Amino acid sequence: GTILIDLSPDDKEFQSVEEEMQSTVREHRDGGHAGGIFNRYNILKIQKVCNKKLWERYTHRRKEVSEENHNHANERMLFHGSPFVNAIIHKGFDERHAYIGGMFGAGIYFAENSSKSNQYVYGIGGGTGCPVHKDRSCYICHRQLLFCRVTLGKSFLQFSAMAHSPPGHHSVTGRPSVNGLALAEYVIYRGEQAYPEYLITYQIMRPE
């Protein structure tokens, strides 16, 4: 029951989502090995993901978390990059979309930095790059990221140099404590705590 609604580039929703995408690009410690070398994107399309069942699943769980956390869902909009983006938008997030080897354990990971999620669009470590050219820094092939509504509830703070959530917590927050330019990464352990709200189709752009 998923439908995708194209947003117009004239729409303020399109513009606000694009700005979040572009403004959260950062340099990566791998020098672009996983995600490619770029400072900005060419946004080709932004679609709204509409699925009533998946939404109701999300808002049900959001209410539960909120009632366990002084009426505060601690909801964020975060990026998700994955080879399973087509499955996620149709069936929702679940245990099959977990990053089993992630630094905070087997959970579903999200980024404040769009360029962090970009590293995972072709798989862990960028896999073997785009399917057409086998290039992790391909400037031709279309990529997709999700911009997702995520319920963090009480988040366990991990200073950073499916499984269960730490007891008493609903998520983990990975706070960067070496790379001063990196934004936070987040992990949830239940698929119902995220809704894939926007599908963004883009290319990375070769620096001038």
Ligand SMILES: Cc1cccc2c(=O)[nH]c(-c3ccc(Cl)cc3)cc12
């Ligand atoms: C580790 C991490 C930090 C911040 C964002 C992300 C992300 O967007 N995706 C992933 C990811 C997704 C799917 C698989 Cl199979 C592996 C890693 C991982 C990830």
Ligand SMILES: [Zn+2]
């Ligand atoms: Zn390619």
